[PDB]
């Protein structure tokens, strides 16, 4: 009847509707192939809306409208179901696995576990139903997802904020970027994993020299060794963001020291060759530069 | 834009356009509207009162 012909076929389609499912490493069963049904639902909805144009539609309006109301609530939950998955998946790598990082974020993790378990129950009941349309009749499904995506986003936000506040304590961190920073925050137990990054946050310096308790110095990408005046004392539990700041200041202070020492030597009239062995490059250079300037000044 | 010969044959094609070749026409209309009005009016209502 131009109408019942279409309505039957929408129904016939949605009673055989199936989400493809493969579970990831632990727990939650993921869905492949979102777009298929998201499209087909959107397409059938459009067919149902436009039906209202028909002149013979008036009497069947009810039987149409019921279907519309069912599909519309599928759409309401589809839109949410997919982003809940996507966000969760992205967050699992950062939160659920590595113990050290979830340790300093008791909170984002403490929420993540509960969301996960709940999203696990709802999904597990969902794919037990052997049809996708059936999902609309699950009590507190739409509600569960909306609460879940909102909460996940609140976590994702919190994390982003946490990190950006973390960098601002030692701004050099802005050169690292998220992944590596998290490695520094967690490895602050060991102190030896921070050495890798000292090319990226300084660039002059390659790696860092320890007495295993104290930091004696650094070694530049060239292979020069800069020995600090005061070795930087470390305790078994101490934040990286602190001694890194102490370090950054002490390398400058140390360069300055070598500068005045060497320059004073040259002032006392030691041969440049004498000096070349005993100081780092930068110090004996600025030395030569300043002293030179003074000499060619009176020489003028 | 070039349509298939198949479309252009089957189809009744109409140009709503101002190509600058429309100016000759359009300045006359304005000229006549502002110069001889009563026959621009009775140009327009030619079908009306009829």
């Amino acid at each position: 009847f131009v109408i019942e012909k279409s309505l039957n076929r929408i129904k016939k389609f949605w009673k055989e509707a199936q989400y493809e499912v493969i579970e990831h490493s632990s727990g939650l069963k993921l869905v492949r192939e979102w777009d298929v049904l998201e499209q087909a639902c959107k397409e059938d909805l459009e067919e149902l809306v436009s039906m209202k144009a028909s002149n013979y539609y008036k009497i069947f309006e009810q039987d149409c409208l019921d279907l519309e109301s069912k599909l519309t609530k599928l759409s309401e939950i589809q839109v949410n179901w997919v982003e809940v998955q996507f966000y969760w998946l992205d967050l699992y790598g950062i939160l659920g696995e590595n113990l050290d990082i979830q340790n300093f974020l008791p909170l984002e993790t403490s929420k993540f576990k509960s969301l996960t378990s709940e999203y696990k129950m709802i999904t597990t009941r969902a794919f037990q139903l052997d049809t996708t349309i059936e999902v609309i009749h699950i009590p507190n499904f739409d509600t569960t997802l909306k609460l879940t995506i909102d909460s996940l986003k609140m976590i994702k936000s919190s994390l982003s904020t946490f990190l950006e506040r973390q960098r601002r304590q030692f701004p050099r961190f802005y050169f690292l970027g998220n992944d590596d920073l998290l490695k520094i925050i967690g490895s602050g137990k060991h102190h030896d994993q921070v050495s890798k990054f000292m090319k990226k946050m300084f660039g002059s310096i390659e790696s860092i020299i320890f007495l295993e308790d104290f930091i004696t110095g650094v070694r530049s990408v060239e292979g020069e060794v800069l020995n600090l005046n005061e070795k930087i004392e470390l305790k078994d539990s101490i934040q990286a963001q602190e001694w890194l700041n102490i370090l950054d200041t002490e390398i400058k202070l140390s360069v300055f020291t070598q500068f005045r020492d060497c320059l004073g030597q040259l002032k006392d009239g030691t041969d440049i060759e004498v000096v070349v062995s005993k100081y780092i490059f930068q110090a004996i250079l600025l030395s030569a530069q300043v002293m030179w300037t003074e000499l060619v000044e009176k020489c003028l | 834009g070039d349509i298939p010969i198949f479309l252009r044959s089957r189809v009744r094609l109409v140009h709503f356009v101002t190509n600058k070749e429309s100016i000759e026409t359009r300045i006359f209309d304005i000229t006549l509207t502002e110069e001889n009005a009563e026959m621009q009016r009775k140009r327009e209502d030619l079908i009306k009162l009829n």
Binding site: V2, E43 | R8, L13, F16
Partner: protein
């Protein structure tokens, strides 16, 4: 036969739209779901512009 309207600025598309009111359904050949959304307009009697 089907009209083919050509205007550089398409004011004519809103002329047809004003003529048929809400009845007008506007489609494009370049939009994705066009093929079906045509099948919808055609079955239930919508006025189409492509």
């Amino acid at each position: 036969a089907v009209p083919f309207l050509l205007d550089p600025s398409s004011h004519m598309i809103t002329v047809i739209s004003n003529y048929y009111g809400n009845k007008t359904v506007l489609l494009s050949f370049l939009e994705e779901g066009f093929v079906k959304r045509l099948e919808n307009a055609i079955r239930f009697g919508s006025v189409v512009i492509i």
